[PDB]
Amino acid sequence: TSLPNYLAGNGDLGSWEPTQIFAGEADIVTEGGAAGADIEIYQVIAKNAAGAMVPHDPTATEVPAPQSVAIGIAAQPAKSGQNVPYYIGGVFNHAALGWHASLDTLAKRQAVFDRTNIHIGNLY
Amino acid sequence: APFVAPNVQGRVIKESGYNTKTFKPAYVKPKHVIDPNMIIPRQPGEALGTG
């Protein structure tokens, strides 16, 4: 870390791409709750049987387990035991969000948030 | 014109009408959300280091 470089050379300093989370104009609404697992930014979240936030996990069970019904979108990342701020309302670009496996197409990603204040849709 | 023996009345000639076209203009509505995740990060003119 000490010396300069006297010799010529090139360097690709880096690249930046915007992440657009909002895809519409509902009332954006947020809440905070304890996490039960490692949650990434804009990961879709559910609440487990103990009321702690857990990343959304459809087909968790033979009766479906409460992790299987999504409840919000993480606004900042958190480790287990920490508080997670998360969105409960708003219109969100499905592409930016973190999704479970097998929840591939937008047609499925909408089905997670029909009965809800959140709605999830495509950007143009 | 119809040829008509001059001993007879003459021939009645038919006509045709006309038509109309009608159009509604289409509608276009793009918009952007401009939340902080887009305002904050350094834009190209900004100096490296501070900005």
TrEMBL record, chain A:
InterPro entries: Head_decoration_D. It holds the Pfam family HDPD. Gene3D superfamilies: Head decoration protein D. This is Decorator protein D. It comes from Chivirus chi.
From TrEMBL, chain B:
Signal peptide: none annotated. It comes from the Viruses. It is found in: Virion; Host cytoplasm. Homomultimer. Belongs to the lambda phage major capsid protein family. Assembles to form an icosahedral capsid. The assembly is primed by the interaction between capsid assembly protease and portal dodecamer, and major capsid proteins assemble cooperatively to form the procapsid with the help of capsid scaffolding protein. Major capsid protein forms hexons and pentons of the icosahedron. Viral genomic DNA is packaged into the procapsid through the portal vertex. The packaging triggers a dramatic reconfiguration of the capsid shell. This is Major capsid protein.
